[PDB]
Amino acid sequence: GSRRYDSRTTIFSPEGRLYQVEYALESISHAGTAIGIMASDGIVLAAERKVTSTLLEQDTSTEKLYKLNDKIAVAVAGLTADAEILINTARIHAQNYLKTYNEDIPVEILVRRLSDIKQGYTQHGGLRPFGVSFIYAGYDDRYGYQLYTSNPSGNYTGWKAISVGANTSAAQTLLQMDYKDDMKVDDAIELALKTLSKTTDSSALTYDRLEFATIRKGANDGEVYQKIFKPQEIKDILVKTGIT
Amino acid sequence: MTDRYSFSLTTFSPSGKLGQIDYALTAVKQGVTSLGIKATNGVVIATEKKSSSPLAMSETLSKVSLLTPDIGAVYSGMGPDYRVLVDKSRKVAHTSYKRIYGEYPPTKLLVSEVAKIMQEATQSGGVRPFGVSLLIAGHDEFNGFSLYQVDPSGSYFPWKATAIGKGSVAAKTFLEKRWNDELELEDAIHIALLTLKESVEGEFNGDTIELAIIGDENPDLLGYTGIPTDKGPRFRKLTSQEINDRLEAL
Amino acid sequence: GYDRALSIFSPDGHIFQVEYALEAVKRGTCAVGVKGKNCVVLGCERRSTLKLQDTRITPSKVSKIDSHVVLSFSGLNADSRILIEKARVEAQSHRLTLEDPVTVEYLTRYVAGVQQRYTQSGGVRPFGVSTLIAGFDPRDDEPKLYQTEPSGIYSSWSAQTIGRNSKTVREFLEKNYDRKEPPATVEECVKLTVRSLLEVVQTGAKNIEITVVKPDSDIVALSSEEINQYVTQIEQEKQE
Amino acid sequence: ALGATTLAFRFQGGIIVAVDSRATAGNWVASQTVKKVIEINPFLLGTMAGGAADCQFWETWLGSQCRLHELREKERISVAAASKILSNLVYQYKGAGLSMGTMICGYTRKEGPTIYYVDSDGTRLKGDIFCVGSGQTFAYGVLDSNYKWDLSVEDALYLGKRSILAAAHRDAYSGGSVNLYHVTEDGWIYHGNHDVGELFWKVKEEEGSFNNVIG
Amino acid sequence: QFNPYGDNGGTILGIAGEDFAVLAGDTRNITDYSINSRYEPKVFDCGDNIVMSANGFAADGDALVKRFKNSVKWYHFDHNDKKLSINSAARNIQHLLYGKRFFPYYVHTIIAGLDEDGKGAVYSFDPVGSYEREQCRAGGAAASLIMPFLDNQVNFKNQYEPGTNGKVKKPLKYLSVEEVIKLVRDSFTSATERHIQVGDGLEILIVTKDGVRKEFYELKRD
Amino acid sequence: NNYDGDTVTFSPTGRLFQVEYALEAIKQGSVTVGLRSNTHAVLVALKRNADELSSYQKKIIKCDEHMGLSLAGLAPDARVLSNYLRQQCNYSSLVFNRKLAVERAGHLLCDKAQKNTQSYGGRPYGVGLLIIGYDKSGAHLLEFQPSGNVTELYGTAIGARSQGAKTYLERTLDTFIKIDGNPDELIKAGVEAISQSLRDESLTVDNLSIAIVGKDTPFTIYDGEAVAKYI
Amino acid sequence: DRGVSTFSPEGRLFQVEYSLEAIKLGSTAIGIATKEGVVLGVEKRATSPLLESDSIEKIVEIDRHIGCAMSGLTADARSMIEHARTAAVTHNLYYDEDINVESLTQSVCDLALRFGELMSRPFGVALLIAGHDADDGYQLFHAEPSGTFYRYNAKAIGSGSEGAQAELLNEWHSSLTLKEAELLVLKILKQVMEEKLDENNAQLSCITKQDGFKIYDNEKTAELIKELKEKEAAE
Amino acid sequence: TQQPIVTGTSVISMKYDNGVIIAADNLGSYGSLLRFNGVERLIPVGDNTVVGISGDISDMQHIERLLKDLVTENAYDNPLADAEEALEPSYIFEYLATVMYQRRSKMNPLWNAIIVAGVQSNGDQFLRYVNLLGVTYSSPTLATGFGAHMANPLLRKVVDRESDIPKTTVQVAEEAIVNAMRVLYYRDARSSRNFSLAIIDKNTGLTFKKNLQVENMKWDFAKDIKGYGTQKI
Ligand SMILES: [Mg+2]
């Protein structure tokens, strides 16, 4: 019958590893680098677009940074199509929580549920896993500013600063070097860009090859604002830090 | 009996490649060249009509398809896969949008729905990916004119101008030299015909070329009068004669 | 639905998928359980290759199943969340129908049953997780410590360890733990647990987690400074 | 559709359970020898009021569930848990037309003597004294006025017997005979069948009650 | 509107002796004021020395008996030809009846046989499955006529020892099979006189350790 | 070789190997014999034990008052098929008040076994059956094979060394067919037939198993001291 | 790979034969049947000294008149026991009586072959089912994952089964008392066990008509072990 | 839940020494309207059974189809289909009775009253009734509808009990049936003069008589009847 053609996506190796999860992580390692840095008064999300073409429409584009709700955003690393499936699920889950409790969903609860979906594809169903790693940046009234990451295994962990995608080994060393706990948002913006500038596989880091976003309490009195940076705004912040 | 193929036929290889998607892209490479160019006051999409036989009527086979009154589509790759995608794309525009909001979806969201269908063929049980890349041109009130590409993986990207299929590498280079942000629609049509002549080998006329535009509203193509807000479709397929007129002053 | 029998017998009478799930447990960070005269202590390793971590929000290794029972584990982290969720649901379901919280033995038997079901169900792989379940039965002061594993077998332990380098720490406990006289106090039990982890861990900074459980739903997690005091005390006595 | 008088009360020495024996189909007396105490197991008792079949069937079913509980947990089932198994079950059938009014009685270590009134519309009440049936009012009157926690086992057995007699006399749909039970921690003890015909005349003479009746 | 139930009349009677048991029933089947059959048996030998009757709505009665006979057959298959005891059969029938608690069999069921000590046994069921063991039980149309007579002659109710000031009851005792059949015949002839649905014929099934014997007696046909 | 992975695959020569491997399980099974006259039909079965401490595996199963079979091969598969026969016999009685014909019984077993040989996932039955019975057209003996093939016979035998008993019955055909109105003599012929398949072992009191059905005889099984008469 | 319900050329089910190899790796379990009762005994086999041996539950009650001992992948036995207990109690509910030991065993064995492509694989555990009923008296059954069950006068299963079975062949007779049977299980267990036999690493049980199924205490078994050693030294 | 539309009235039958007789008129009423006059309500099954049906005609035509299909199915893989393993009246009856009870238990009955008359393989007479409720009974005489009230009393004067069956000839039994059909024509408002009659004999087999008419009727005395009491003219 059909047994002949089954790849058996949800099995263990002799060494106790999940083949497909490991190979999905290998796929993600070739994706454009995405960095998240958490400060005391906000969070930065920076991401490198995959080898841009000059005729690509830059201003009306979205590849790396997606909005989940007013208080939570994600940076993507891997297959964009796979990420969008998961993102719409996450957007729906957040609204279900708001509908049920009349309160914005706590960041971890959203992350756990999305991570549990990934886990399911590794244990049952016979389907390939989602070739996606997320960086979750968000705020709630319990834990304040939070950074998480999830990967195809369905395992998630919290971070002060973290990178996913390509050159994470080199990127994590640079972040570990210059990061400190009493850091401000404006300083974190500078660190994020400097790290990408050194770990990039491109010749020089430019505005058209980047996506950028912040989550500050910079709005008027005790409320959070999400700022997805425009092309011209990235051009300005790149000059202001002295990279171009 | 029954579909026993409930498992994925597309899986990750040790190197991290999704084989079936890569092979689907290879099928698109073999396909005939199609392109799209965005102007300030419109969008143009074009392709060569590769005829299987001279006895065949190439008018009956339409490579450029209307999805909504303001959105059109063209492809490169496997024709049959494209035909069913157009059917599904037209239906999803109604079921998941028009029947809810009482209006046609904006270009980006319809593209998103088509991308979802193509992504599912990459992960669902007992199916192969679609062997096509789409170029979807459209207009909507709040976003204006837009042009999108959609790949077998389900990934989509917005373009100022681009090409896909056989001679896409050369065609993209040609478009980089000619494209600017001040192009009028007629200028974009002219450039589209120049670009397409390079990839076409045999006859080059209105009968062998298929070309449509997303431009101004067409009250004459609406089919009725009396409602001021309804002004007609922005999608218009250029006729065989209309193409030949522009080939003289080329 | 996906029906494939993934867990099956081999010529020599082994179920490789279950045995490979044990290899995943062997890869996981070390976890230790030691029960005293009036308490149980759960110790856990945290690997130090991960700096720039946020310990406030990062999932803790020890999880409360109910107010009186806790569960730690070694192996795949994502898999553990599924067992913990099911266990928490069953704990509340038991209170609802029996009008009494679960015993530690019952909760262990349930979790072990879930693990077993995944070893002979079509379309699923076994859990790559072994658990240490500890606590006190309702209106009871006798300490309980149980272990489970992917196959579905479970049993009670005076003291036990699981995860990477667990055979080393089990060797330590086998000579240091006396059945006739277990750790009489909380301090003695925690010290023996920390000592056992210090045979394997590396440094006693932010690598060791300790959780103490006492009778009548009295559970508390130790902070860095509190644990560091045990580390400082043990090293000074060692130099002799 | 069953007229009955059933009672059960907690006291110093455990639980007394007492019931009548009559079954009627309208005015027609079908039986005088009905067993309205269901022996769920050696430690648990159940009373039958409302539907005869509903009470028999589901309280026998309950004994099967209690046996499975102690096989898996190696411990006697609580009266609380046993009563809740039954109440949760009839709640599932709510609206379908089940008819029950029962007292689940037991004596354990952690609880002591315990009685739960369980009913077909989902009610589950813990209490000290319960009376159920067409003759419950008559039995309550004797119980309330004479009940004390520090009753002896002999006096408690008589009180339950006398309370059923009171109802059997006045309530047309109650009578036949009286079945007594004493529930202890070590199990229940049957205290015989007592024909109301012979019992009435005996109590009249010895007690001096029922002067309205010529004998 | 369609009414799925009907009344086929008839009456049945089960008495239990010391080492025997009888199950009697009239052979008349009716609808409204018409006679369908003057001889339509409704007491059956079901095997394992168990006799059974389900009186009321005949269609439901035949279905139940048919299902129980089938239940006996499968008890032998599944349990190495073990003999089904009368008490086990009773419990089994409860589950058959209660299985249709919300669309009942409109029948009064009675079974007779010998218990495991060899003593006579009779069990009676309500339409939804409640059951009880009894010495004496009448069921059906004329149960109200027959039953108080049995109370008086079998269980000696309301009969006191002569001269004892009504202080000493008449002593209970087992009756012979001959004395029981006399009471059965007199019970049915009396019911035949005063109940229109009772008559035509009387069929009795007697159960001893030796087996199942039958006896038939004519009744008035008006 | 490459064509025996499952039952859905044909070999290049047109063979179904999984069905043939199921047939092999019957050959390993203990011997059982079937034979009939015009008035009666008899089953004789050699029971097998694990060791001296164990019991002897029961080979004969009753299906109705007028029908039953003996088994050889996987016993659980015989339980499934015998249970199916019990239901079909029973369906015929409840619905049509009719005793199921022994020929229809065979047709039903054939069709049930067949479905397991044409579909993916499932497997063939691993047991052979000898069905006897007495219906409206007299005595009958059937041989069931898990390929689906059912055959009506005067006599036969299946299991290990069944060729010896089958040869004997082929010689004795004219004699035992006319044993009418004599149960004990028909059994004797069956016991002598199964004796031709014995090696080293002989027929003992708790080893032999006999069953009979006929004109005025319900299907009944004889074991233990009840078969001491025929040794 | 290959199908789960596949036959070998020799006419056996691969997966059933492979599960039998798993049972040979399991700890030893012995059962002996007498006219005074049936005795069941098992090797606990703790993997480490820190493991509390009293939590090792390899002898199990099904009903008051039926007991059970296991050997092999013991986790697989949980659902078998659950089914057996339900079957026993359900039969009592339907028929107001105790269920025959053979009928109980048959019900358990019906699960055995309900696997394929139902559960994904056969059970990797063998069971000794001991009990009493009014018809056939004291009985001992051996239930395999093949769906087959044999009745036995005495039977050993597990790693030391072939050696223990040969010993049971010589020692068993029809006039064995209950006390004699108890000692005989301990004697044979001590012979095949790796570690030295005591009350903590071995467990006894029995089933009698009068008192029903009972698992022996460690104190009671310890005295029977001491009684056994003295009798062997006495000649 | 149904209501009958096009209906058939009484079906009458009885046993005699060597076999059974059954009869029914050829009418299909539509309420008070005597709409259809060529309706056959006796349906033979083989050469040894006749099923007589009253009540809803659409449900009768459904049963005709079931019986026809039953004969076809019995012949499948059956060499003795015209001999030992042919369909018996008892087989045909039990099948219908099973169906009728199943349909009433789904609250969707076949609105009919059926009488199965025939002769068994051993020569025994078979006569049994079943209706929309699944109720079954047997008797020396059986009738449906008005026939139960008017025919049975006349047929029971001939065969009052079991012992009267050997004493009753086919000539006498047929005479009683034909007389009963006349009485029903006098007194049943939904009856017709035309009818069918069938005899199943153990020796002479199945005799099916069509297009019979009620005759030898008494109407002459009507001329003498004037007014409703006092009227003389
Ligand atoms: Mg009259």
Curated annotation (Swiss-Prot), chain A:
One of its GO terms (biological process) is proteasomal ubiquitin-independent protein catabolic process. InterPro entries: Ntn_hydrolases_N (IPR029055), Proteasome_alpha (IPR050115), Proteasome_alpha-type (IPR023332), Proteasome_asu_N (IPR000426), Proteasome_bsu_CS (IPR016050), Proteasome_sua/b (IPR001353). Keywords: Cytoplasm, Isopeptide bond, Nucleus, Proteasome, Ubl conjugation. GO terms for cellular component: cytosol; nucleus; proteasome complex; proteasome core complex, alpha-subunit complex; proteasome storage granule. It comes from the Eukaryota. Its main location: cytoplasm. It is found in: Cytoplasm; Nucleus. There is a cross-link at residues 99, 198, 230 (Glycyl lysine isopeptide (Lys-Gly) (interchain with G-Cter in ubiquitin)). It holds the Pfam family Proteasome_A_N. Belongs to the peptidase T1A family. Present with 17100 molecules/cell in log phase SD medium. The proteasome degrades poly-ubiquitinated proteins in the cytoplasm and in the nucleus. It is essential for the regulated turnover of proteins and for the removal of misfolded proteins. The proteasome is a multicatalytic proteinase complex that is characterized by its ability to cleave peptides with Arg, Phe, Tyr, Leu, and Glu adjacent to the leaving group at neutral or slightly basic pH. It has an ATP-dependent proteolytic activity. This is Proteasome subunit alpha type-3. It comes from Saccharomyces cerevisiae (strain ATCC 204508 / S288c) (Baker's yeast).
Swiss-Prot record, chain C:
GO terms for biological process: proteasomal ubiquitin-independent protein catabolic process; proteasome-mediated ubiquitin-dependent protein catabolic process. SMART domains: Proteasome_A_N. The modification Phosphothreonine is found at residue 58. SUPFAM superfamilies: N-terminal nucleophile aminohydrolases (Ntn hydrolases). It is found in: Cytoplasm; Nucleus. Keywords: Cytoplasm, Nucleus, Phosphoprotein, Proteasome. One of its GO terms (cellular component) is proteasome core complex, alpha-subunit complex. It comes from the Eukaryota. Present with 16800 molecules/cell in log phase SD medium. The 26S proteasome consists of a 20S proteasome core and two 19S regulatory subunits. The 20S proteasome core is composed of 28 subunits that are arranged in four stacked rings, resulting in a barrel-shaped structure. The two end rings are each formed by seven alpha subunits, and the two central rings are each formed by seven beta subunits. The catalytic chamber with the active sites is on the inside of the barrel. Interacts with CIC1. The proteasome degrades poly-ubiquitinated proteins in the cytoplasm and in the nucleus. It is essential for the regulated turnover of proteins and for the removal of misfolded proteins. The proteasome is a multicatalytic proteinase complex that is characterized by its ability to cleave peptides with Arg, Phe, Tyr, Leu, and Glu adjacent to the leaving group at neutral or slightly basic pH. It has an ATP-dependent proteolytic activity.
Curated annotation (Swiss-Prot), chain F:
The modification Phosphoserine is found at residue 11. This is Proteasome subunit alpha type-6. It comes from Saccharomyces cerevisiae (strain ATCC 204508 / S288c). InterPro entries: Ntn_hydrolases_N, Proteasome_alpha, Proteasome_alpha-type, Proteasome_asu_N, Proteasome_sua/b. Present with 7210 molecules/cell in log phase SD medium. It holds the Pfam family Proteasome. GO terms for cellular component: nucleus; proteasome complex; proteasome core complex, alpha-subunit complex; proteasome storage granule. It is found in: Cytoplasm; Nucleus.
Curated annotation (Swiss-Prot), chain H:
InterPro entries: Ntn_hydrolases_N, Proteasome_beta4, Proteasome_bsu_CS, Proteasome_sua/b, Proteasome_suB-type. One of its GO terms (biological process) is proteasome assembly. Pfam families: Proteasome. One of its GO terms (cellular component) is nucleus. Its main location: cytoplasm. The keyword Nucleus applies. Belongs to the peptidase T1B family. Non-catalytic component of the proteasome which degrades poly-ubiquitinated proteins in the cytoplasm and in the nucleus. It is essential for the regulated turnover of proteins and for the removal of misfolded proteins. The proteasome is a multicatalytic proteinase complex that is characterized by its ability to cleave peptides with Arg, Phe, Tyr, Leu, and Glu adjacent to the leaving group at neutral or slightly basic pH. It has an ATP-dependent proteolytic activity. PRE3 and PRE4 are necessary for the peptidyl-glutamyl-peptide-hydrolyzing activity. The 26S proteasome consists of a 20S proteasome core and two 19S regulatory subunits. The 20S proteasome core is composed of 28 subunits that are arranged in four stacked rings, resulting in a barrel-shaped structure. The two end rings are each formed by seven alpha subunits, and the two central rings are each formed by seven beta subunits. The catalytic chamber with the active sites is on the inside of the barrel. Interacts with CIC1. Present with 16900 molecules/cell in log phase SD medium.
